[PDB]
PDB file of C-alpha atoms and ligand atoms in Angstrom:
ATOM      1  CA  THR L   1      12.435  15.135  60.479  1.00  0.00           C
ATOM      2  CA  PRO L   2      12.298  15.050  56.582  1.00  0.00           C
ATOM      3  CA  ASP L   3       9.268  12.798  56.444  1.00  0.00           C
ATOM      4  CA  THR L   4       7.660  14.798  59.224  1.00  0.00           C
ATOM      5  CA  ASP L   5       8.375  18.087  57.569  1.00  0.00           C
ATOM      6  CA  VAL L   6       7.027  16.967  54.259  1.00  0.00           C
ATOM      7  CA  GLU L   7       3.880  15.747  55.993  1.00  0.00           C
ATOM      8  CA  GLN L   8       3.364  18.917  58.038  1.00  0.00           C
ATOM      9  CA  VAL L   9       3.967  21.033  54.991  1.00  0.00           C
ATOM     10  CA  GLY L  10       1.353  18.979  53.190  1.00  0.00           C
ATOM     11  CA  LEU L  11      -1.145  19.447  55.958  1.00  0.00           C
ATOM     12  CA  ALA L  12      -0.545  23.167  55.862  1.00  0.00           C
ATOM     13  CA  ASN L  13      -1.219  23.198  52.129  1.00  0.00           C
ATOM     14  CA  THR L  14      -4.476  21.257  52.542  1.00  0.00           C
ATOM     15  CA  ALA L  15      -5.688  23.609  55.296  1.00  0.00           C
ATOM     16  CA  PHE L  16      -5.119  26.611  53.081  1.00  0.00           C
ATOM     17  CA  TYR L  17      -7.420  25.153  50.370  1.00  0.00           C
ATOM     18  CA  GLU L  18      -9.905  23.781  52.925  1.00  0.00           C
ATOM     19  CA  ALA L  19     -10.222  27.249  54.436  1.00  0.00           C
ATOM     20  CA  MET L  20     -11.262  28.582  51.031  1.00  0.00           C
ATOM     21  CA  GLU L  21     -13.640  25.723  50.500  1.00  0.00           C
ATOM     22  CA  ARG L  22     -15.522  26.532  53.720  1.00  0.00           C
ATOM     23  CA  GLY L  23     -15.247  30.290  53.382  1.00  0.00           C
ATOM     24  CA  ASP L  24     -13.270  30.514  56.617  1.00  0.00           C
ATOM     25  CA  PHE L  25     -11.523  33.858  56.411  1.00  0.00           C
ATOM     26  CA  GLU L  26     -10.170  33.862  59.933  1.00  0.00           C
ATOM     27  CA  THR L  27      -8.325  30.584  59.475  1.00  0.00           C
ATOM     28  CA  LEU L  28      -7.143  31.597  56.031  1.00  0.00           C
ATOM     29  CA  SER L  29      -5.714  34.804  57.489  1.00  0.00           C
ATOM     30  CA  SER L  30      -4.004  32.839  60.229  1.00  0.00           C
ATOM     31  CA  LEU L  31      -2.287  30.611  57.662  1.00  0.00           C
ATOM     32  CA  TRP L  32      -0.415  33.471  56.039  1.00  0.00           C
ATOM     33  CA  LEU L  33       2.881  34.728  57.331  1.00  0.00           C
ATOM     34  CA  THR L  34       3.240  37.879  59.384  1.00  0.00           C
ATOM     35  CA  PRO L  35       6.623  39.508  60.167  1.00  0.00           C
ATOM     36  CA  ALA L  36       5.744  38.950  63.833  1.00  0.00           C
ATOM     37  CA  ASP L  37       5.644  35.205  63.006  1.00  0.00           C
ATOM     38  CA  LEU L  38       9.281  35.726  62.115  1.00  0.00           C
ATOM     39  CA  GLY L  39       9.922  37.890  65.146  1.00  0.00           C
ATOM     40  CA  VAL L  40      10.477  41.186  63.301  1.00  0.00           C
ATOM     41  CA  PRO L  41      13.728  46.378  55.518  1.00  0.00           C
ATOM     42  CA  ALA L  42      14.751  43.410  53.414  1.00  0.00           C
ATOM     43  CA  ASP L  43      11.017  42.950  53.749  1.00  0.00           C
ATOM     44  CA  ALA L  44      11.444  39.782  55.777  1.00  0.00           C
ATOM     45  CA  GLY L  45       8.152  37.901  55.951  1.00  0.00           C
ATOM     46  CA  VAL L  46       6.340  40.121  53.433  1.00  0.00           C
ATOM     47  CA  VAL L  47       3.842  38.071  51.541  1.00  0.00           C
ATOM     48  CA  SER L  48       2.501  38.054  48.017  1.00  0.00           C
ATOM     49  CA  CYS L  49      -0.086  36.412  45.885  1.00  0.00           C
ATOM     50  CA  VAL L  50      -0.902  35.838  42.216  1.00  0.00           C
ATOM     51  CA  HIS L  51      -4.342  34.711  41.384  1.00  0.00           C
ATOM     52  CA  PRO L  52      -4.952  33.147  38.004  1.00  0.00           C
ATOM     53  CA  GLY L  53      -4.441  35.857  35.337  1.00  0.00           C
ATOM     54  CA  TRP L  54      -3.883  38.582  37.948  1.00  0.00           C
ATOM     55  CA  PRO L  55      -1.115  41.004  38.554  1.00  0.00           C
ATOM     56  CA  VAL L  56       0.871  40.681  41.775  1.00  0.00           C
ATOM     57  CA  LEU L  57      -0.566  41.460  45.223  1.00  0.00           C
ATOM     58  CA  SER L  58       1.884  42.394  47.907  1.00  0.00           C
ATOM     59  CA  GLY L  59       1.637  42.608  51.636  1.00  0.00           C
ATOM     60  CA  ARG L  60      -0.991  41.143  53.929  1.00  0.00           C
ATOM     61  CA  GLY L  61      -3.450  43.902  53.201  1.00  0.00           C
ATOM     62  CA  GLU L  62      -3.738  43.484  49.467  1.00  0.00           C
ATOM     63  CA  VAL L  63      -3.389  39.739  49.784  1.00  0.00           C
ATOM     64  CA  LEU L  64      -5.935  39.158  52.592  1.00  0.00           C
ATOM     65  CA  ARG L  65      -8.254  41.724  51.077  1.00  0.00           C
ATOM     66  CA  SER L  66      -8.358  39.727  47.842  1.00  0.00           C
ATOM     67  CA  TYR L  67      -9.181  36.468  49.678  1.00  0.00           C
ATOM     68  CA  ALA L  68     -11.899  38.137  51.732  1.00  0.00           C
ATOM     69  CA  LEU L  69     -13.335  39.371  48.441  1.00  0.00           C
ATOM     70  CA  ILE L  70     -13.025  36.048  46.660  1.00  0.00           C
ATOM     71  CA  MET L  71     -14.735  34.283  49.513  1.00  0.00           C
ATOM     72  CA  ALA L  72     -17.420  36.935  49.741  1.00  0.00           C
ATOM     73  CA  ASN L  73     -18.128  36.426  46.013  1.00  0.00           C
ATOM     74  CA  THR L  74     -18.171  32.646  45.829  1.00  0.00           C
ATOM     75  CA  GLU L  75     -21.161  30.515  46.748  1.00  0.00           C
ATOM     76  CA  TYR L  76     -19.296  27.253  46.217  1.00  0.00           C
ATOM     77  CA  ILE L  77     -15.658  26.249  45.691  1.00  0.00           C
ATOM     78  CA  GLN L  78     -13.905  22.906  45.709  1.00  0.00           C
ATOM     79  CA  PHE L  79     -10.243  22.243  45.000  1.00  0.00           C
ATOM     80  CA  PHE L  80      -9.143  18.838  43.754  1.00  0.00           C
ATOM     81  CA  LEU L  81      -5.413  18.842  44.048  1.00  0.00           C
ATOM     82  CA  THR L  82      -3.214  16.640  42.026  1.00  0.00           C
ATOM     83  CA  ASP L  83       0.420  16.211  41.131  1.00  0.00           C
ATOM     84  CA  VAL L  84       1.370  17.605  44.539  1.00  0.00           C
ATOM     85  CA  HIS L  85       5.149  17.915  45.007  1.00  0.00           C
ATOM     86  CA  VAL L  86       6.890  19.090  48.192  1.00  0.00           C
ATOM     87  CA  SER L  87      10.409  20.413  48.556  1.00  0.00           C
ATOM     88  CA  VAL L  88      11.655  21.311  51.984  1.00  0.00           C
ATOM     89  CA  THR L  89      14.909  23.175  52.358  1.00  0.00           C
ATOM     90  CA  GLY L  90      15.741  24.464  55.828  1.00  0.00           C
ATOM     91  CA  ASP L  91      12.994  26.643  57.162  1.00  0.00           C
ATOM     92  CA  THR L  92      11.377  27.097  53.760  1.00  0.00           C
ATOM     93  CA  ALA L  93       9.150  24.733  51.818  1.00  0.00           C
ATOM     94  CA  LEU L  94       8.032  24.782  48.233  1.00  0.00           C
ATOM     95  CA  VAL L  95       4.828  23.064  47.186  1.00  0.00           C
ATOM     96  CA  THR L  96       3.715  22.763  43.548  1.00  0.00           C
ATOM     97  CA  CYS L  97       0.370  21.286  42.553  1.00  0.00           C
ATOM     98  CA  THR L  98      -2.348  21.222  40.004  1.00  0.00           C
ATOM     99  CA  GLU L  99      -5.456  22.988  41.292  1.00  0.00           C
ATOM    100  CA  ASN L 100      -8.464  21.427  39.579  1.00  0.00           C
ATOM    101  CA  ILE L 101     -11.039  23.958  40.700  1.00  0.00           C
ATOM    102  CA  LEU L 102     -14.801  23.752  40.515  1.00  0.00           C
ATOM    103  CA  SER L 103     -16.706  26.840  41.506  1.00  0.00           C
ATOM    104  CA  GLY L 104     -20.054  28.465  41.698  1.00  0.00           C
ATOM    105  CA  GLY L 105     -20.723  32.155  42.196  1.00  0.00           C
ATOM    106  CA  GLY L 106     -24.793  29.448  40.032  1.00  0.00           C
ATOM    107  CA  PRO L 107     -23.425  27.030  37.326  1.00  0.00           C
ATOM    108  CA  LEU L 108     -20.255  25.108  38.177  1.00  0.00           C
ATOM    109  CA  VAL L 109     -17.257  26.065  36.141  1.00  0.00           C
ATOM    110  CA  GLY L 110     -13.966  24.238  36.155  1.00  0.00           C
ATOM    111  CA  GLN L 111     -10.451  25.685  35.972  1.00  0.00           C
ATOM    112  CA  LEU L 112      -7.177  23.914  35.373  1.00  0.00           C
ATOM    113  CA  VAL L 113      -4.639  25.873  37.345  1.00  0.00           C
ATOM    114  CA  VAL L 114      -1.109  25.180  38.570  1.00  0.00           C
ATOM    115  CA  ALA L 115       0.336  26.670  41.754  1.00  0.00           C
ATOM    116  CA  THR L 116       3.551  27.252  43.574  1.00  0.00           C
ATOM    117  CA  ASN L 117       3.095  27.841  47.250  1.00  0.00           C
ATOM    118  CA  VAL L 118       5.972  28.900  49.449  1.00  0.00           C
ATOM    119  CA  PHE L 119       5.883  28.150  53.156  1.00  0.00           C
ATOM    120  CA  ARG L 120       7.949  29.337  56.010  1.00  0.00           C
ATOM    121  CA  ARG L 121       8.550  27.561  59.259  1.00  0.00           C
ATOM    122  CA  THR L 122       7.241  29.291  62.382  1.00  0.00           C
ATOM    123  CA  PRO L 123       6.727  28.306  66.002  1.00  0.00           C
ATOM    124  CA  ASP L 124       3.023  28.421  65.239  1.00  0.00           C
ATOM    125  CA  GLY L 125       3.521  26.122  62.242  1.00  0.00           C
ATOM    126  CA  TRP L 126       4.216  26.398  58.514  1.00  0.00           C
ATOM    127  CA  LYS L 127       2.936  29.671  57.171  1.00  0.00           C
ATOM    128  CA  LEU L 128       2.336  30.938  53.596  1.00  0.00           C
ATOM    129  CA  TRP L 129       4.790  33.418  52.271  1.00  0.00           C
ATOM    130  CA  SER L 130       3.672  33.272  48.674  1.00  0.00           C
ATOM    131  CA  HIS L 131       0.902  31.799  46.531  1.00  0.00           C
ATOM    132  CA  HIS L 132       1.269  31.874  42.773  1.00  0.00           C
ATOM    133  CA  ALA L 133      -1.478  30.353  40.678  1.00  0.00           C
ATOM    134  CA  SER L 134      -1.795  30.292  36.953  1.00  0.00           C
ATOM    135  CA  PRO L 135      -3.923  28.884  34.142  1.00  0.00           C
ATOM    136  CA  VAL L 136      -2.635  26.032  32.032  1.00  0.00           C
ATOM    137  CA  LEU L 137      -3.378  27.403  28.554  1.00  0.00           C
ATOM    138  CA  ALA L 138      -3.721  25.371  25.328  1.00  0.00           C
TER     139      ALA L 138
ATOM    140  CA  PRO H   1      20.630  42.767  54.543  1.00  0.00           C
ATOM    141  CA  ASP H   2      20.992  45.897  52.447  1.00  0.00           C
ATOM    142  CA  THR H   3      23.542  43.677  50.730  1.00  0.00           C
ATOM    143  CA  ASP H   4      21.317  40.680  50.482  1.00  0.00           C
ATOM    144  CA  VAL H   5      18.712  42.636  48.624  1.00  0.00           C
ATOM    145  CA  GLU H   6      21.379  43.829  46.188  1.00  0.00           C
ATOM    146  CA  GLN H   7      22.942  40.408  45.662  1.00  0.00           C
ATOM    147  CA  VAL H   8      19.483  38.832  45.090  1.00  0.00           C
ATOM    148  CA  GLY H   9      18.687  41.605  42.652  1.00  0.00           C
ATOM    149  CA  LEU H  10      21.880  40.854  40.833  1.00  0.00           C
ATOM    150  CA  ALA H  11      21.085  37.138  40.613  1.00  0.00           C
ATOM    151  CA  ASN H  12      17.591  37.932  39.348  1.00  0.00           C
ATOM    152  CA  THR H  13      19.130  40.325  36.774  1.00  0.00           C
ATOM    153  CA  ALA H  14      21.715  37.720  35.660  1.00  0.00           C
ATOM    154  CA  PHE H  15      18.924  35.136  35.148  1.00  0.00           C
ATOM    155  CA  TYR H  16      16.977  37.262  32.687  1.00  0.00           C
ATOM    156  CA  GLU H  17      20.119  38.421  30.955  1.00  0.00           C
ATOM    157  CA  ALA H  18      21.290  34.848  30.309  1.00  0.00           C
ATOM    158  CA  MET H  19      17.998  34.104  28.644  1.00  0.00           C
ATOM    159  CA  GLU H  20      18.139  37.291  26.589  1.00  0.00           C
ATOM    160  CA  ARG H  21      21.544  36.371  25.246  1.00  0.00           C
ATOM    161  CA  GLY H  22      20.797  32.675  25.073  1.00  0.00           C
ATOM    162  CA  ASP H  23      23.518  31.741  27.510  1.00  0.00           C
ATOM    163  CA  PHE H  24      22.699  28.222  28.592  1.00  0.00           C
ATOM    164  CA  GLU H  25      25.795  27.683  30.598  1.00  0.00           C
ATOM    165  CA  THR H  26      25.143  30.695  32.836  1.00  0.00           C
ATOM    166  CA  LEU H  27      21.449  29.945  33.086  1.00  0.00           C
ATOM    167  CA  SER H  28      22.264  26.382  34.056  1.00  0.00           C
ATOM    168  CA  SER H  29      24.630  27.572  36.768  1.00  0.00           C
ATOM    169  CA  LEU H  30      22.039  30.006  38.160  1.00  0.00           C
ATOM    170  CA  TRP H  31      19.577  27.254  38.874  1.00  0.00           C
ATOM    171  CA  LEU H  32      20.043  25.348  42.085  1.00  0.00           C
ATOM    172  CA  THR H  33      21.465  21.860  42.392  1.00  0.00           C
ATOM    173  CA  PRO H  34      21.199  19.769  45.609  1.00  0.00           C
ATOM    174  CA  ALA H  35      25.010  19.690  45.613  1.00  0.00           C
ATOM    175  CA  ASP H  36      24.843  23.499  46.169  1.00  0.00           C
ATOM    176  CA  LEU H  37      23.073  22.608  49.356  1.00  0.00           C
ATOM    177  CA  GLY H  38      25.383  19.730  50.260  1.00  0.00           C
ATOM    178  CA  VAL H  39      23.150  16.769  49.368  1.00  0.00           C
ATOM    179  CA  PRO H  40      13.779  12.757  51.116  1.00  0.00           C
ATOM    180  CA  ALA H  41      12.308  16.189  51.556  1.00  0.00           C
ATOM    181  CA  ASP H  42      13.534  16.820  48.046  1.00  0.00           C
ATOM    182  CA  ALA H  43      15.862  19.497  49.419  1.00  0.00           C
ATOM    183  CA  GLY H  44      16.789  21.905  46.623  1.00  0.00           C
ATOM    184  CA  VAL H  45      14.652  20.325  43.868  1.00  0.00           C
ATOM    185  CA  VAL H  46      13.760  23.019  41.362  1.00  0.00           C
ATOM    186  CA  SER H  47      10.528  23.809  39.530  1.00  0.00           C
ATOM    187  CA  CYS H  48       9.493  26.123  36.704  1.00  0.00           C
ATOM    188  CA  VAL H  49       6.287  27.517  35.294  1.00  0.00           C
ATOM    189  CA  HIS H  50       6.485  29.356  31.994  1.00  0.00           C
ATOM    190  CA  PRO H  51       3.524  31.479  30.935  1.00  0.00           C
ATOM    191  CA  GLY H  52       0.516  29.262  30.387  1.00  0.00           C
ATOM    192  CA  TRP H  53       2.495  26.053  30.954  1.00  0.00           C
ATOM    193  CA  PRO H  54       2.093  23.314  33.436  1.00  0.00           C
ATOM    194  CA  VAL H  55       4.751  22.720  36.056  1.00  0.00           C
ATOM    195  CA  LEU H  56       8.228  21.496  35.136  1.00  0.00           C
ATOM    196  CA  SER H  57      10.068  19.729  37.979  1.00  0.00           C
ATOM    197  CA  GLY H  58      13.759  18.928  38.350  1.00  0.00           C
ATOM    198  CA  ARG H  59      16.774  20.388  36.616  1.00  0.00           C
ATOM    199  CA  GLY H  60      16.426  18.119  33.588  1.00  0.00           C
ATOM    200  CA  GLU H  61      12.843  19.139  32.754  1.00  0.00           C
ATOM    201  CA  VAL H  62      13.614  22.725  33.532  1.00  0.00           C
ATOM    202  CA  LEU H  63      16.840  23.009  31.463  1.00  0.00           C
ATOM    203  CA  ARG H  64      15.426  21.091  28.563  1.00  0.00           C
ATOM    204  CA  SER H  65      12.672  23.653  28.398  1.00  0.00           C
ATOM    205  CA  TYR H  66      15.150  26.567  28.341  1.00  0.00           C
ATOM    206  CA  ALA H  67      17.170  25.028  25.470  1.00  0.00           C
ATOM    207  CA  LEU H  68      13.974  24.589  23.495  1.00  0.00           C
ATOM    208  CA  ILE H  69      12.684  28.105  24.278  1.00  0.00           C
ATOM    209  CA  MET H  70      16.012  29.594  23.316  1.00  0.00           C
ATOM    210  CA  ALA H  71      16.236  27.556  20.114  1.00  0.00           C
ATOM    211  CA  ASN H  72      12.775  28.617  19.074  1.00  0.00           C
ATOM    212  CA  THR H  73      13.112  32.296  19.999  1.00  0.00           C
ATOM    213  CA  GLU H  74      14.998  34.406  17.535  1.00  0.00           C
ATOM    214  CA  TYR H  75      14.918  37.474  19.744  1.00  0.00           C
ATOM    215  CA  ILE H  76      13.915  38.158  23.319  1.00  0.00           C
ATOM    216  CA  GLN H  77      14.220  41.010  25.710  1.00  0.00           C
ATOM    217  CA  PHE H  78      12.930  41.395  29.242  1.00  0.00           C
ATOM    218  CA  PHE H  79      12.263  44.754  30.780  1.00  0.00           C
ATOM    219  CA  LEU H  80      11.528  44.179  34.420  1.00  0.00           C
ATOM    220  CA  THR H  81       9.433  46.473  36.423  1.00  0.00           C
ATOM    221  CA  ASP H  82       8.172  46.855  39.908  1.00  0.00           C
ATOM    222  CA  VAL H  83      10.756  44.449  41.208  1.00  0.00           C
ATOM    223  CA  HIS H  84      10.314  43.528  44.837  1.00  0.00           C
ATOM    224  CA  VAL H  85      12.683  41.546  47.060  1.00  0.00           C
ATOM    225  CA  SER H  86      11.982  39.848  50.360  1.00  0.00           C
ATOM    226  CA  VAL H  87      14.831  38.084  52.155  1.00  0.00           C
ATOM    227  CA  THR H  88      14.200  35.730  55.037  1.00  0.00           C
ATOM    228  CA  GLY H  89      17.167  33.751  56.299  1.00  0.00           C
ATOM    229  CA  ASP H  90      18.577  31.816  53.368  1.00  0.00           C
ATOM    230  CA  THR H  91      15.621  32.266  51.077  1.00  0.00           C
ATOM    231  CA  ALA H  92      14.682  35.215  48.945  1.00  0.00           C
ATOM    232  CA  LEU H  93      11.397  35.928  47.247  1.00  0.00           C
ATOM    233  CA  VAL H  94      11.322  38.185  44.273  1.00  0.00           C
ATOM    234  CA  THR H  95       8.153  39.265  42.454  1.00  0.00           C
ATOM    235  CA  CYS H  96       8.259  41.293  39.295  1.00  0.00           C
ATOM    236  CA  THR H  97       6.615  42.337  36.103  1.00  0.00           C
ATOM    237  CA  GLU H  98       8.241  40.831  33.019  1.00  0.00           C
ATOM    238  CA  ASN H  99       7.654  43.209  30.146  1.00  0.00           C
ATOM    239  CA  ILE H 100       8.613  40.811  27.362  1.00  0.00           C
ATOM    240  CA  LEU H 101       9.497  41.721  23.800  1.00  0.00           C
ATOM    241  CA  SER H 102      10.145  38.946  21.343  1.00  0.00           C
ATOM    242  CA  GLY H 103      10.418  38.238  17.662  1.00  0.00           C
ATOM    243  CA  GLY H 104      10.716  35.390  15.229  1.00  0.00           C
ATOM    244  CA  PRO H 105      12.727  34.956  12.085  1.00  0.00           C
ATOM    245  CA  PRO H 106      12.158  37.397   9.299  1.00  0.00           C
ATOM    246  CA  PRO H 107      10.062  36.654   6.174  1.00  0.00           C
ATOM    247  CA  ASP H 108      13.192  37.321   4.219  1.00  0.00           C
ATOM    248  CA  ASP H 109      16.653  38.737   3.847  1.00  0.00           C
ATOM    249  CA  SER H 110      15.319  42.328   3.728  1.00  0.00           C
ATOM    250  CA  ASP H 111      14.429  42.249   7.405  1.00  0.00           C
ATOM    251  CA  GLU H 112      16.315  41.610  10.571  1.00  0.00           C
ATOM    252  CA  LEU H 113      13.404  40.064  12.383  1.00  0.00           C
ATOM    253  CA  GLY H 114       9.844  39.097  12.093  1.00  0.00           C
ATOM    254  CA  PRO H 115       7.242  41.297  13.704  1.00  0.00           C
ATOM    255  CA  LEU H 116       7.735  41.995  17.350  1.00  0.00           C
ATOM    256  CA  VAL H 117       5.321  40.859  20.017  1.00  0.00           C
ATOM    257  CA  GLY H 118       4.930  42.089  23.612  1.00  0.00           C
ATOM    258  CA  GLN H 119       3.725  40.228  26.710  1.00  0.00           C
ATOM    259  CA  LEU H 120       2.696  41.378  30.139  1.00  0.00           C
ATOM    260  CA  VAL H 121       3.730  38.692  32.554  1.00  0.00           C
ATOM    261  CA  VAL H 122       4.401  38.655  36.299  1.00  0.00           C
ATOM    262  CA  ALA H 123       6.822  36.312  38.120  1.00  0.00           C
ATOM    263  CA  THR H 124       7.580  34.950  41.478  1.00  0.00           C
ATOM    264  CA  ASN H 125      11.219  33.833  41.729  1.00  0.00           C
ATOM    265  CA  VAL H 126      12.496  32.006  44.792  1.00  0.00           C
ATOM    266  CA  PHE H 127      16.224  32.109  45.427  1.00  0.00           C
ATOM    267  CA  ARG H 128      18.373  30.198  47.781  1.00  0.00           C
ATOM    268  CA  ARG H 129      21.601  31.231  49.529  1.00  0.00           C
ATOM    269  CA  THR H 130      24.528  29.002  48.512  1.00  0.00           C
ATOM    270  CA  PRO H 131      28.271  29.367  48.835  1.00  0.00           C
ATOM    271  CA  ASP H 132      28.378  30.232  45.141  1.00  0.00           C
ATOM    272  CA  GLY H 133      25.715  32.848  45.404  1.00  0.00           C
ATOM    273  CA  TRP H 134      21.976  33.062  45.152  1.00  0.00           C
ATOM    274  CA  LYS H 135      20.532  30.292  43.064  1.00  0.00           C
ATOM    275  CA  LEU H 136      17.064  29.857  41.654  1.00  0.00           C
ATOM    276  CA  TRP H 137      14.834  27.320  43.332  1.00  0.00           C
ATOM    277  CA  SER H 138      11.571  28.235  41.570  1.00  0.00           C
ATOM    278  CA  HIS H 139      10.510  30.455  38.740  1.00  0.00           C
ATOM    279  CA  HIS H 140       6.787  30.887  38.214  1.00  0.00           C
ATOM    280  CA  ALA H 141       5.622  33.182  35.467  1.00  0.00           C
ATOM    281  CA  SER H 142       2.145  33.932  34.281  1.00  0.00           C
ATOM    282  CA  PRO H 143       0.217  36.177  31.886  1.00  0.00           C
ATOM    283  CA  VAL H 144      -1.661  39.120  33.223  1.00  0.00           C
ATOM    284  CA  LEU H 145      -5.019  38.539  31.502  1.00  0.00           C
ATOM    285  CA  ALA H 146      -7.778  41.076  30.697  1.00  0.00           C
TER     286      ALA H 146
HETATM  287 CL1  LIG C 201      15.632  29.414  55.053  1.00  0.00          CL
HETATM  288 CL1  LIG C 202       0.121  38.654  28.161  1.00  0.00          CL
HETATM  289 MG1  LIG C 203      16.608  43.563  29.721  1.00  0.00          MG
END
């Protein structure tokens, strides 16, 4: 269903951020697409990630490496998501949101970030194909 | 497959070219409409993030922004590098580096343009298979910051 899809895509999005918040690398890894998830040259299922102000990370290794690092370097992170919009088309879903981030590596510093997350439908649930996050600059 | 990658590449190329040459009609046509999909779950609703901007949602917000950008940009060229395409079913994901060169109006009649400025930007573009070709669903661009 449409309503169901939107809801399940939302839950997948929440999980992704919750996994960061609790420093749960195993879950986080599980939430990202693998070509096996797809049942695998046109690089079907190949993932990427842009962290705020970063160049592009490609493939599970660079991507998961960066999250393992981030988590290993952060003592405290909370995401307060707003303006969340979901678009589901076929077996792909597009989520945009504002990431209002508070972190501590330590004094709490806030970031205003916007993200586009792309999800893919798999038997094991909606999986991340791409995360692109960027600063909102004045 | 081998063809999909090439067609997507072509659509991605056409998108940047339209902007370069300030072709609103082509740019408009390159962005998805829900009619392209045959239209809830906001099937085929587009979004756009320009460097440093918040999110623009829906064709109206997105196209308005392109008219404005074009109107306020005397000269722009993109030089894409490190383009990568990933096709899965009816969706394609393209990441790239936008090496952007722009310029404003000149101080006077003795010059063609104002000084030129470069930007290092990276993008994730999400395309969608339609009977009329690959159409943009999302463009998200961001500065690469030191
Ligand atoms: Cl699809
Ligand atoms: Cl820059
Ligand atoms: Mg060019």
